[PDB]
Amino acid sequence: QSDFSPYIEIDLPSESRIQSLHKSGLAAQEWVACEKVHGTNFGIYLINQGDHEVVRFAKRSGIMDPNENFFGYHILIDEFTAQIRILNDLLKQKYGLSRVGRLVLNGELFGAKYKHPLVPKSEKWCTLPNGKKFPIAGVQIQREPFPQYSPELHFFAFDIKYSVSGAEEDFVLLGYDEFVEFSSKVPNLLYARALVRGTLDECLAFDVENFMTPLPALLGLGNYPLEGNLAEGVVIRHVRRGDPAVEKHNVSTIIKLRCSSFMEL
Ligand SMILES: Nc1ncnc2c1ncn2[C@@H]1O[C@H](COP(=O)(O)OP(=O)(O)OP(=O)(O)O)[C@@H](O)[C@H]1O
Numbered sequence: 463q464s465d466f467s468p469y470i471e472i473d474l475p476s477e478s479r480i481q482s483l484h485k486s487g488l489a490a491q492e493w494v495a496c497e498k499v500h501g502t503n504f505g506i507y508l509i510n511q512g513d514h515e516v517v518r519f520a521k522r523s524g525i526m527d528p529n530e531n532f533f534g535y536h537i538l539i540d541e542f543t544a545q546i547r548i549l550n551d552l553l554k555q556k557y558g559l560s561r562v563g564r565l566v567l568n569g570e571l572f573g574a575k576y577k578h579p580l581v582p583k584s585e586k587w588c589t590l591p592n593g594k595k596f597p598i599a600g601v602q603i604q605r606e607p608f609p610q611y612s613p614e615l616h617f618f619a620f621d622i623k624y625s626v627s628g629a630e631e632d633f634v635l636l637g638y639d640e641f642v643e644f645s646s647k648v649p650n651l652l653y654a655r656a657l658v659r660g661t662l663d664e665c666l667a668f669d670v671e672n673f674m675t676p677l678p679a680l681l682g683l684g685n686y687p688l689e690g691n692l693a694e695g696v697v698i699r700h701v702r703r704g705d706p707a708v709e710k711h712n713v714s715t716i717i718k719l720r721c722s723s724f725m726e727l
């Protein structure tokens with residue numbers, strides 16, 4: 463697991479966090495709110511090993527053996543592999559890097575549930591390296607009645623970091639604008655996009671209670687609405703989260719808000 467980098471949990475806004483964000487000056491700077499997707503944590507890794515490299519996939523708790531069946535994600539490996547190679551090439555070219563020890567594209571694996579009679583369940587079957595196959599129609603990432611996104615499996619990117627040396631302490635996290643710029647150039651990559659942008663308080667004013675997930679319509683299902691299909695919530699973050707000048711204040715610059723309807727499930 464030496465190549466694995468755990469992603470994070472995200473807190474609801476506490477009194478001490480909010481006070482510190484104001485006192486530090488960070489609250490007055492630029493923040494975004496993006497959709498919080500209810501799937502399972504996923505990471506796509508590209509690891510440099512000198513003149514060769516390897517693609518690996520992680521769940522919440524670590525990089526997986528290639529024959530671990532995990533919600534049918536093998537159906538997306540060819541896509542992920544093409545995507546992560548493109549992202550690495552973009553980063554190397556733009557940043558003048560001969561080598562990137564470790565590139566980590568974190569996001570949410572989601573979908574494979576959409577209970578509308580005009581939306582057939584997936585007919586797709588994944589295949590593992592050992593030849594075993596599993597139906598996407600049998601995948602149940604989450605049991606909750608909302609949010610529901612799509613009958614197919616998808617990946618929602620929400621962070622990109624790279625370590626030139628490969629060492630954990632040398633990771634550089636893309637800021638929001640750079641994250642969007644690069645992600646927008648990776649073909650067919652779905653990624654977190656700002657629902658609102660402004661001060662911390664402007665983002666905190668986002669109406670999560672009535673926020674219907676926009677993903678079904680983005681994924682072809684605009685004509686097949688599900689009643690009460692609220693998004694889980696939002697993640698709010700400083701647009702330069704990870705930058706040393708932000709991090710020097712020693713205050714976390716990521717928080718979440720959830721809708722009450724979701725919390726009650
Ligand atoms: N836009 C997003 N930005 C960051 N994390 C997101 C986003 N959308 C979904 N997530 C997920 O939210 C998780 C953090 O939220 P939180 O601390 O509430 O954990 P959780 O969602 O309850 O955990 P679980 O993975 O078991 O559902 C992340 O680890 C990530 O998997």
Ligand SMILES: [Mg+2]
Pocket residue numbers: 499500501
């Ligand atoms: Mg979750």
